Design a protein around this nucleic acid. Sequence first.
DNA 1: GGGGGAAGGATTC
DNA 2: CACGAATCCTTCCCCC
Length: 341
Amino acid sequence: MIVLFVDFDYFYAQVEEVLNPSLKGKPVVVCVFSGRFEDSGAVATANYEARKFGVKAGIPIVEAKKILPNAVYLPMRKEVYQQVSSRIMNLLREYSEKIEIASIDEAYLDISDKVRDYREAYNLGLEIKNKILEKEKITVTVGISKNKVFAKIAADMAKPNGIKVIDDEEVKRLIRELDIADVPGIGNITAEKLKKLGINKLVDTLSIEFDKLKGMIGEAKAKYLISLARDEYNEPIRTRVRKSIGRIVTMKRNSRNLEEIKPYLFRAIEESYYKLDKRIPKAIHVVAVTEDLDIVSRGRTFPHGISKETAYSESVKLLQKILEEDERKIRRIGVRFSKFI
DNA sequence: GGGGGAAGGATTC
DNA sequence: CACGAATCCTTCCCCC
Ligand SMILES: [Ca+2]
Ligand SMILES: [Ca+2]
Ligand SMILES: [Ca+2]
């Protein structure tokens, strides 16, 4: 099996660059402004020019501006990036018939048939790279290997605007030399748990008793890491189906006042419904981000679909449940709809 | 003992 | 100061 992973470079920022080419070469910082105060919010993404100075996703817009006061700061336009993304996916869709659109800027292609051997895969990568740059002016990094994980890891090492193949010989090398933190799906929480177990490399996961591993990072994560360390990971390429739709907004000020929160919650619901399509959810969750940035939620599954009126009403009950069962003030509030009919 | 949901939280990208 | 969604997990519960 040959997997070709495609990852659009600094996507949001690059799109803004495509929509306004005079931006090229300048530090471009796409931000999600929260509205709690001038420049409150975080950086969603930044082009590499901004990144080489530490301005990256997750840092507050205020910290980025102190580092790069003259960069171009743009409000994130999710809808625009999604439409652009959809076009690129369609473009890729004609290269493989087997595609897994992992997110707005990532997709895996099972080109096991379309190609044979990594030379032809590599060449196909360039075909895809040139095609995307041609029709959309979007540079992407391509990762190629035997499975999604290493295909993704290949892209991680080749970005930006690169292409890399990780042959079966290197797979083995990385299995014992790649920091396990750099393995997809292993975040800081898991990375630390593995460090405390003596696992710093994928192969080290073979030094632990499975049940001890399972006990520490969960069975699913244990079997995942083990399979990769044995060079046996082989999950198929298949785009998952949207299982939930929601929206969560940040309030101007933290609150515990029902009437003060409702408007935000209702706006969340309204946008969530517009997003749903003709899709009808049977489950609804009200999600709140507490003042200490903790996330709490209360939901309910109905035996039928949820009309907007029912949503408006149940969400208020769920929000009252949250306030009733958690003392903290609420910073962000929203809803998530799932279990579509 | 354990299937099968549902619920609330943990994690990751 | 810090802004959508999938899986996975663990807990609880109904119940055969
Ligand atoms: Ca990515
Ligand atoms: Ca990317
Ligand atoms: Ca990591």
